[PDB]
Amino acid sequence: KVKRDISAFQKVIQDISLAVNKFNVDIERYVGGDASHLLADGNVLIKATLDGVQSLQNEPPLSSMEALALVGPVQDLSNQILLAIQNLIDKKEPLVQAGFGGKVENNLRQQEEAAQKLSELVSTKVPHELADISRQLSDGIAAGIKKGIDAFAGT
Amino acid sequence: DISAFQKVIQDISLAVNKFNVDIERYVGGDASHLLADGNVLIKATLDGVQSLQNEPPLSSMEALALVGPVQDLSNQILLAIQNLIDKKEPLVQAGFGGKVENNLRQQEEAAQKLSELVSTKVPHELADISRQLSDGIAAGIKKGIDAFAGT
Amino acid sequence: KVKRDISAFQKVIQDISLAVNKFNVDIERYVGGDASHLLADGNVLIKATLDGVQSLQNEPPLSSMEALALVGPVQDLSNQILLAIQNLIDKKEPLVQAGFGGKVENNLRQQEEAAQKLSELVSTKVPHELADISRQLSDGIAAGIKKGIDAFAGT
Amino acid sequence: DISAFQKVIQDISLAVNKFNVDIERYVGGDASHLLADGNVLIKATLDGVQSLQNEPPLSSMEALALVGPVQDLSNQILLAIQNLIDKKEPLVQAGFGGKVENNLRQQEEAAQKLSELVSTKVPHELADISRQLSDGIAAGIKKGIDAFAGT
Numbered sequence: 001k002v003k004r005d006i007s008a009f010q011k012v013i014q015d016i017s018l019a020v021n022k023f024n025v026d027i028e029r030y031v032g033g034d035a036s037h038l039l040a041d042g043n044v045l046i047k048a049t050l051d052g053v054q055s056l057q058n059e060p061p062l063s064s065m066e067a068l069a070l071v072g073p074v075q076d077l078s079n080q081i082l083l084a085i086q087n088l089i090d091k092k093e094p095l096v097q098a099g100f101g102g103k104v105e106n107n108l109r110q111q112e113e114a115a116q117k118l119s120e121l122v123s124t125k126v127p128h129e130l131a132d133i134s135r136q137l138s139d140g141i142a143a144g145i146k147k148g149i150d151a152f153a154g155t
Numbered sequence: 156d157i158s159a160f161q162k163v164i165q166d167i168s169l170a171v172n173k174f175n176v177d178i179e180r181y182v183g184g185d186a187s188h189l190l191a192d193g194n195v196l197i198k199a200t201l202d203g204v205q206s207l208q209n210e211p212p213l214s215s216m217e218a219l220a221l222v223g224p225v226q227d228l229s230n231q232i233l234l235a236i237q238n239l240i241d242k243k244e245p246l247v248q249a250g251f252g253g254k255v256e257n258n259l260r261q262q263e264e265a266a267q268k269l270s271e272l273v274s275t276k277v278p279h280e281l282a283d284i285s286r287q288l289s290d291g292i293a294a295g296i297k298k299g300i301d302a303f304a305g306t
Numbered sequence: 307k308v309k310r311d312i313s314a315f316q317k318v319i320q321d322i323s324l325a326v327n328k329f330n331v332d333i334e335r336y337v338g339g340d341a342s343h344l345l346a347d348g349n350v351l352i353k354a355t356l357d358g359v360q361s362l363q364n365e366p367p368l369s370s371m372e373a374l375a376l377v378g379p380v381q382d383l384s385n386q387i388l389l390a391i392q393n394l395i396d397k398k399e400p401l402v403q404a405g406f407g408g409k410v411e412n413n414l415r416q417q418e419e420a421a422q423k424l425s426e427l428v429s430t431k432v433p434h435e436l437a438d439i440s441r442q443l444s445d446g447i448a449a450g451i452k453k454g455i456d457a458f459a460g461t
Numbered sequence: 462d463i464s465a466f467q468k469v470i471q472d473i474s475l476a477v478n479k480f481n482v483d484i485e486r487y488v489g490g491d492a493s494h495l496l497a498d499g500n501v502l503i504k505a506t507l508d509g510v511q512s513l514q515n516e517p518p519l520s521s522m523e524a525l526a527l528v529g530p531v532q533d534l535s536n537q538i539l540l541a542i543q544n545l546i547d548k549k550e551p552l553v554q555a556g557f558g559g560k561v562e563n564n565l566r567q568q569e570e571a572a573q574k575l576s577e578l579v580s581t582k583v584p585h586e587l588a589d590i591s592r593q594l595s596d597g598i599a600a601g602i603k604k605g606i607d608a609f610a611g612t
């Protein structure tokens with residue numbers, strides 16, 4: 001316990017990664033029909049994201065060293081989120097034909113709202129020396145979610 | 156066809172009643188299962204928002220057919236909130252007071268989204284009673300938030 | 307605009323200082339009788355304190371340089387709060403005789419609660435290199451408020 | 462002697478009514494005076510908690526004497542909350558949405574302290590109605606919080 005125990009931050013990353021990866025597996029396996037289980041995966045992901053905001057609210061700021069140590073796990077999580085979004089977009093045809101396009105749209109709008117809250121929280125923990133890269137990562141994920149929102153809009 | 160509304164009500168009822176089963180028999184110790192039950196309930200609530208968002212408003216006949224199930228669900232939610240408050244002592248002793256507070260804040264936000272959406276779907280003849288039931292739930296959640304605050 | 311604009315933090319300090327100083331002047335001028343105006347001064351101080359929590363919630367962390375620059379204004383504010391508390395305690399006799407001892411006690415308990423919330427907020431903004439001195443300043447103010455609570459307890 | 466209760470009611474009524482005067486005639490522009498009005502109202506509310514904390518419970522006859530003034534005050538608070546919501550557009554255009562949201566969160570916390578205290582003072586014969594009025598105010602504050610969230 002000499003150093004910081006930044007395990008709170010690592011746990012949030014892992015919890016979100018677990019939710020993303022379950023969604024991703026299910027979206028890749030999906031080849032048509034009822035998509036309720038995908039919406040439910042999305043809602044476990046929203047819960048993980050909002051759990052993060054609450055878990056980390058009262059944490060002290062990250063040092064440069066502490067934040068640097070999280071750059072790897074955060075870039076990995078970005079990569080995973082962006083891939084999951086692409087795999088979702090890839091399944092637009094079966095999803096829309098099954099009558100789930102709107103519902104997916106609506107889930108994505110809730111993902112966007114939750115991601116924005118978590119990004120905002122993160123910006124209150126990162127030291128200035130990592131503020132630009134952290135914002136870049138957050139913007140990438142926001143742009144990915146918007147791509148998904150745009151793909152399912154009007155369906 | 157109003158099966159979308161009946162499915163939401165049933166899914167939330169499943170989750171509320173499972174929570175009531177577990178909280179009534181909880182006397183102390185680890186409460187992770189109770190938080191999980193609350194998570195399922197938030198997910199059901201959000202699934203409801205996503206499901207009903209683009210449904211057109213209910214006719215007086217369609218809404219009337221939902222009155223029984225809705226009123227029962229209201230009563231079950233009010234019971235869940237009171238049961239939770241009743242178990243504050245063991246939950247706080249177990250170190251779960253802050254977790255319960257945080258989960259209730261998420262319940263409050265999800266419920267508010269669903270309530271606002273419901274108010275757009277109900278016909279005027281049932282608007283005042285629907286609002287009364289929604290307000291009771293919202294106020295009850297807040298009373299739970301008050302009970303666990305600072306723990 | 308090149309540097310941080312830490313004016314949000316300075317405004318909170320000034321707003322609290324304004325409320326403290328009005329209370330202090332009124333407590334020193336008080337020599338008996340109705341003390342409702344003192345309770346009202348205390349409640350302007352509670353508002354300033356809670357306004358601070360809300361104003362600063364979404365700020366990014368302070369750098370070492372930024373936090374260092376606030377050490378002076380924060381020590382001055384501590385000095386002012388501790389003095390006000392002493393001047394309040396000094397007036398215990400007329401306050402108690404006027405029937406205001408409980409009410410002062412209750413006001414102080416609300417000051418304590420609000421100061422705890424603000425201290426907690428401050429701990430989420432200070433970088434580690436100033437975390438011990440910031441905690442020491444916060445503890446000093448808490449100990450002062452407790453001295454006042456103890457003086458008016460049971461009255 | 463229940464003058465302490467009458468003074469609290471009058472002080473909160475002064476503040477609520479001043480706010481109603483100002484919000485009803487507000488059509489846009491700087492809203493700093495409206496926030497000041499809200500600040501006075503929070504101070505009055507907290508002054509009430511501090512004042513009544515140690516007063517013993519009300520007899521049925523003492524509480525009955527407060528029913529008129531309390532019910533009027535309830536109605537004025539519900540009006541203030543609706544009036545505020547009605548002026549969301551000019552308040553948000555003026556750049557005051559977040560300030561209003563933050564002030565309402567403080568109103569909510571102050572009101573919850575005072576409501577909890579009141580519930581300890583009211584005799585049983587008026588407990589259910591007192592709680593109903595308190596819940597309506599709490600839920601109304603929350604509806605204002607919802608209206609200004611994210612602005």
Ligand SMILES: CCCCC/C=C\C/C=C\C/C=C\C/C=C\CCCC(=O)O
Pocket residue numbers: 016023038039040041042045049081084085088103104107108111112115116118119120122137138139141145
């Ligand atoms: C089936 C319905 C759709 C399922 C959802 C589809 C894909 C996953 C979507 C979005 C990713 C959501 C949340 C990512 C969470 C946190 C990163 C942002 C926080 C930050 O930047 O700090």
Ligand SMILES: CCCCC/C=C\C/C=C\C/C=C\C/C=C\CCCC(=O)O
Pocket residue numbers: 009010012013016052067068070071074077078118119122123125126130133134135137138141
């Ligand atoms: C590269 C910055 C270094 C660490 C960032 C700090 C904290 C993040 C740790 C936990 C928060 C949980 C998930 C992060 C969500 C999305 C990626 C972060 C995007 C951002 O950066 O907003």
Ligand SMILES: CCCCC/C=C\C/C=C\C/C=C\C/C=C\CCCC(=O)O
Pocket residue numbers: 167171174189190192193194196200232235236239255258259262265266267269270271273288289290292296
């Ligand atoms: C560990 C915490 C778990 C506590 C869970 C117990 C109760 C949760 C309380 C309320 C949420 C229940 C249902 C939400 C669904 C409908 C109400 C909103 C719709 C409306 O009103 O129109």
Ligand SMILES: CCCCC/C=C\C/C=C\C/C=C\C/C=C\CCCC(=O)O
Pocket residue numbers: 160163164167203218219221222225226228229269270273276277281284285286288289
């Ligand atoms: C008793 C009058 C209300 C009947 C209106 C009929 C149907 C409402 C439609 C859907 C309800 C769906 C989810 C919310 C379920 C229960 C919470 C109380 C509902 C409310 O009331 O918000």
Ligand SMILES: CCCCC/C=C\C/C=C\C/C=C\C/C=C\CCCC(=O)O
Pocket residue numbers: 315316318319322358373374376377380381383384424425428429431432436439440441443444447
């Ligand atoms: C001494 C380190 C620098 C601290 C600066 C950070 C935040 C202070 C600025 C604004 C907050 C407003 C008032 C602070 C109140 C009491 C002194 C700070 C106590 C602490 O230290 O908790």
Ligand SMILES: CCCCC/C=C\C/C=C\C/C=C\C/C=C\CCCC(=O)O
Pocket residue numbers: 322329344345347348351355387390391394409410413414417418420421422424425426428443444445447448451454
């Ligand atoms: C009738 C009673 C009048 C009040 C008595 C006098 C003073 C109240 C004392 C303290 C409350 C004032 C300020 C708290 C502000 C900053 C400290 C934040 C805690 C921290 O950052 O560490």
Ligand SMILES: CCCCC/C=C\C/C=C\C/C=C\C/C=C\CCCC(=O)O
Pocket residue numbers: 466469470473509524525527528531532534535575579582583587590591592594595
């Ligand atoms: C009709 C309710 C019976 C009146 C109870 C008698 C006295 C109330 C006690 C204290 C009054 C002081 C402050 C609160 C004032 C108004 C809000 C509604 C309160 C309520 O409704 O409690």
Ligand SMILES: CCCCC/C=C\C/C=C\C/C=C\C/C=C\CCCC(=O)O
Pocket residue numbers: 473477480495496498499502506538541542545561564565568571572573575576577579594595596598602
């Ligand atoms: C700019 C924001 C200003 C908004 C102000 C408008 C309305 C504020 C609403 C409610 C607070 C008013 C009074 C609190 C009094 C009584 C409730 C507690 C006692 C009880 O219930 O028993």
